[PDB]
């Protein structure tokens, strides 16, 4: 029991948050036109990176009536994400991008990102429960957007880049992390209702291992291995 | 006077809310691609039904700075709307859809829906007045979105379905219920300013009768009768 | 020092606000289809004028979790903007439009509008500082949207008019007032951090003179002079 309690209480800042930022900004760099956008519109590229890094907090704040940029009061967290964005886009002489994009190192940051994703899902359900004790649909919605993040607002992340693809969206066709966050927010909600006979730390540990194995396998298979 | 006081104080839950949900989900089913969407993207179809059922509360909460999903704390109300959505889309062996879509029965639910629409317009003006005693434009805006509902956000209801028709919107070209809600929110605001020499229950009664006669006639004429 | 204190404390209502409304509605009238929109959809034209007049307050309220229409409790301010919208669009027999659009008179209102823009940038940083003492990114974001105004939501101002041009936006390609508001909100934030060794009234005075000279020159040069 001590292993599940220690695994579910590790400080995510700054190492696990940096891994979350690295993977998110790497995905941004591989989007069509992102490199050219960072040179012609550097501010819009930075703002796009902030959406990838903190979109889950923006979305949760929007759903609960809090300031959508409330999370940007975390100065050192925003500065850390900005440094990741700068090193990946404007530092060819720096070994940072080549190291973090190296697949063995990249798979470690993918696993650490899943640790942050599961913690954010649980915190969303817990925070929504604090405001609505028996509001099950509010808990599920809050935990879902904390896990999915920028994927649910992808239509407007594209709009910021000058792209408009209204034929599809993350709700009409869910990817794996969005669908997995939906199953995850239901399990964490049922754990709050005491109908799920599982401890909270055991669910955080087991669901994180499920997300780590799936994401590491998908990232390695997507790289043809 | 007792008839207007009893008509304007009938509990809308659950019968009048169910009639509101039935008519709203029926309109959703007749939209292009809705049946295919409910089979390929059942969650997006459900979320689209929630926008049709509770869009007026989402919009009013957005205008006043409240949580946009605050109304989803009403568990039994959300569950009731979900049951209407399920019976209309995934129950061909159940006599529910054929009965509620039968035109004589459908016209009764259309009339009951207008009872709910007028009550929501008045409650929007009253609630906005409680926060802004002499904020006339806030009262009118709040009562308008409580009456119009999902129509004012139709461009983004279409976006959820993969449709984008930016050439028109409900503000640029108002339909009858949106235009009637605009006239209704002005009358209820003037009744709050005491410049309109009419009782509050008399205005609820008379304006509901106006909406019932118009909506029943339009629904029957639209069916070629 | 008394000149900078008197220049930065002049009541903007109603004269300086009227100049802000006149220039904003004039820009609206010169947009493609605006005159035809005011005749076929007068309410949508009015709502579009309100976005041009009060979009900076709507955007700031959205960023900080306040009611997006909170500024519409200022009745006399909304009525004043409505009168400017009515005189410019529906009064050909009235000398108002021809006088305010006359270039020498128009350049005076352009200068007075810049006085209001700088005051709104400073008030945005000050108000965000009141809620977040050391939230630098929240102060900069709040002051930026107070200065840029409707430009940052131009994609949805176009959507209200039935126009959709997703290839560009005000963030991907900043115009001068949006870019100048970004530099302005940084200077006013640094003045709040006490790292900028300049008085608050001296920064308001000098930055307003910079915006007046730039905007008057651009408006006169754009008219080929
Ligand atoms: Cl900090
Ligand atoms: Cl590469
Ligand atoms: Cl309940
Ligand atoms: Cl049928
Ligand atoms: Cl007033
Ligand atoms: Cl002219």
Swiss-Prot record, chains A, B, C:
Q: Which GO terms describe its cellular component?
A: nuclear membrane; sarcoplasmic reticulum membrane
Q: Which residues lie on this side of the membrane: Cytoplasmic?
A: 29-42, 95-98, 154-174
The UniProt record lists the keyword NAD: no
Which reaction is this enzyme known to catalyze?
Answer: K(+)(in) = K(+)(out)
For this UniProt record, the keywords arranged alphabetically read as follows: Ion channel, Ion transport, Membrane, Nucleus, Potassium, Potassium channel, Potassium transport, Sarcoplasmic reticulum, Transmembrane, Transmembrane helix, Transport
Stretches that traverse the bilayer: 11-28, 43-64, 77-94, 99-117, 136-153, 175-192, 201-221
Q: Where in the cell is it found?
A: Sarcoplasmic reticulum membrane; Nucleus membrane
Reported regulation of activity:
Channel activity is activated by a change of voltage within the sarcoplasmic reticulum lumen and blocked by luminal high Ca(2+) levels.
The record's disulfide annotation reads none
User: Could you tell me which residue ranges are on the Lumenal side of the membrane?
Assistant: 65-76, 118-135, 193-200
The record describes its membrane topology as: Multi-pass membrane protein
Consequence the record notes for mutating residue 120 to A: Pore remains open
A GO biological process of this protein is:
regulation of release of sequestered calcium ion into cytosol
Residues that, per the record, bind Ca(2+)? 65
Query: Is S-adenosyl-L-methionine among this UniProt entry's keywords?
Result: no
The residues listed in the UniProt record as binding a 1,2-diacyl-sn-glycero-3-phospho-(1D-myo-inositol-4,5-bisphosphate), with positions renumbered to this chain, are 113, 117
Q: Name one GO molecular function term.
A: identical protein binding
Kindly state the subunit structure of this protein: Homotrimer; conformation seems to be controled by binding to diacylglycerol (DAG).
Q: What's its job? A: Intracellular monovalent cation channel required for maintenance of rapid intracellular calcium release. Acts as a potassium counter-ion channel that functions in synchronization with calcium release from intracellular stores. Opened by a change of voltage within the sarcoplasmic reticulum lumen.
As for family, the record states: Belongs to the TMEM38 family.
Query: What is the name listed in the Swiss-Prot or TrEMBL entry for this protein?
Result: Trimeric intracellular cation channel type A
- Species of origin reads Gallus gallus (Chicken)
Q: Which residues of the complete protein does this chain represent?
A: 10 to 234 of 296
């Amino acid at each position: 029991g001590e292993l599940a309690a220690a695994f579910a209480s590790v400080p995510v800042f700054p190492l696990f948050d940096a891994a979350y930022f690295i993977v998110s900004v790497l995905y941004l760099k591989y989007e069509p036109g992102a490199v050219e956008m960072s040179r012609k519109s550097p501010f819009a590229s930075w703002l796009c990176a902030m959406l990838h890094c903190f979109g889950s907090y923006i979305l949760a704040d929007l759903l609960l009536g809090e300031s959508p940029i409330h999370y940007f009061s975390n100065n050192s967290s925003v500065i850390l994400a900005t440094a990741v964005w700068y090193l990946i886009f404007f530092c060819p002489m720096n070994l940072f991008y080549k190291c973090v994009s190296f697949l063995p190192v990249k798979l470690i940051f993918v696993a650490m990102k899943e640790v942050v994703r599961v913690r954010k899902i649980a915190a969303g359900v817990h925070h929504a429960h604090h405001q609505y004790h028996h509001g099950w649909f509010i808990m599920m919605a809050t935990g879902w957007v904390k896990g999915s993040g920028v994927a649910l607002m992808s239509n407007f992340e594209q709009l910021l880049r000058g792209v408009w693809r209204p034929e599809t969206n993350e709700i009409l066709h869910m990817s794996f992390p969005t669908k997995a966050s939906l199953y995850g927010t239901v399990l964490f909600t049922l754990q709050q209702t005491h109908w799920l006979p599982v401890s909270e730390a055991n669910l955080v540990f087991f669901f994180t291992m499920f997300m780590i194995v799936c994401k590491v396998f998908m990232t390695a298979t997507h790289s043809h291995a």
